[PDB]
């Protein structure tokens, strides 16, 4: 029900190739742009890929305000279902809330062959901190600045963040965190040492909470939050390809 046009570079991306699929999920207020280089690299290597645009994302923040986390889940379920028609083995990877949605999916779908969450969020104390300051909360908050080490990169993201959406995110994370123990599939967890948006300790929470026997944390020493576009991008791609091949 978006009323604004999809921004250039924020379109969903599909590639139909082999019988192994990768679903790529972008983050909160973010767009497919943050995940596109990964998507193209995986498609080139012969994977069928689906990079959806989350409902209310990549248009305008007014559109986002109307959406709930169930809408964002539905956008990822559509992508999953699209892969399931073309693929017998499926991996899911995501940045930030895209990582949260990756964990969410694996909690609901045991058939998922492996997950690659990247700076995934299950606990962001800054949200409660902003809600408890005593002041009237604006309907729309000025968004946190783009967090990248590479100075020449610009994340495509909303300049304002609806308060309603932030509350929706907090609810999504709370449920996702609570059910981490349902995940048993292999997990490759990337975390930026210097993430100024999602506390790096989230990676430890996820690592300890999931029940997976095959799990690993890989630390990114040359990236901030938006690692998929940052200096460690080629290593993320290389390590993920290794992970997919090992489990495909
Ligand atoms: P990821 O999904 C990447 C999106 C880029 N960051 N943003 N936004 O991050 C998920 C969590 C969103 C950032 C959490 C910080 C929000 C803190 C604001 C709380 C309200 C304070 C205003 C008074």
Residue numbers in the entry: 2 to 249
Passage from the reporting paper:
Monoacylglycerol lipases (MGLs) play an important role in lipid catabolism across all kingdoms of life by catalyzing the release of free fatty acids from monoacylglycerols. Here, we present a comprehensive study of five crystal structures of MGL from Bacillus sp. H257 in its free form and in complex with different substrate analogs and the natural substrate 1-lauroylglycerol. Crystallographic studies of MGLs have resulted in the determination of three-dimensional structures of human MGL (hMGL) and its ortholog from a moderately thermophilic soil bacterium Bacillus sp. H-257 (bMGL) in free form and in complex with inhibitors. Both MGLs possess the expected α/β-hydrolase core domain harboring a catalytic triad. The occurrence of different conformations reveals a high degree of conformational plasticity of the cap region.
Therefore, we determined crystal structures of bMGL in complex with ligands of different alkyl chain lengths (12, 14, and 16 carbons; subsequently referred to as Cx ligands, whereby x refers to the number of carbons in the alkyl chain) to mimic the MG substrates myristoyl-, palmitoyl-, and stearoylglycerol. The bMGL·C14 (palmitoylglycerol mimic) and bMGL·C16 (stearoylglycerol mimic) ligand complexes were crystallized under the same condition equally yielding crystals of space group P21. These structures were determined at resolutions of 1.85 and 2.2 Å, respectively. The bMGL complex structures with the C14 and C16 ligands bound in the active site show clear electron densities for all residues of the cap region. Interestingly, chains A and B of the bMGL·C14 and bMGL·C16 ligand complexes show a partially restricted binding pocket and an open glycerol exit hole similar to conformation II. Chains C and D of the bMGL-C14, and bMGL-C16 ligand structures show even more pronounced restriction of access to the binding pocket accompanied by the closure of the glycerol exit hole denoted as conformation III. In the bMGL·C14 complex, the movement of Ile-145 also restricts the orientation of the azide headgroup of the C14 ligand bound to Ser-97. In conformation III, Ile-145 engages in close contacts with the ligand, which results in positioning of the azide headgroup deep within the binding pocket to avoid steric clashes with Ile-145. In the bMGL·C14 complex, a bend in the aliphatic chain allows the longer chain to be accommodated in the binding pocket.
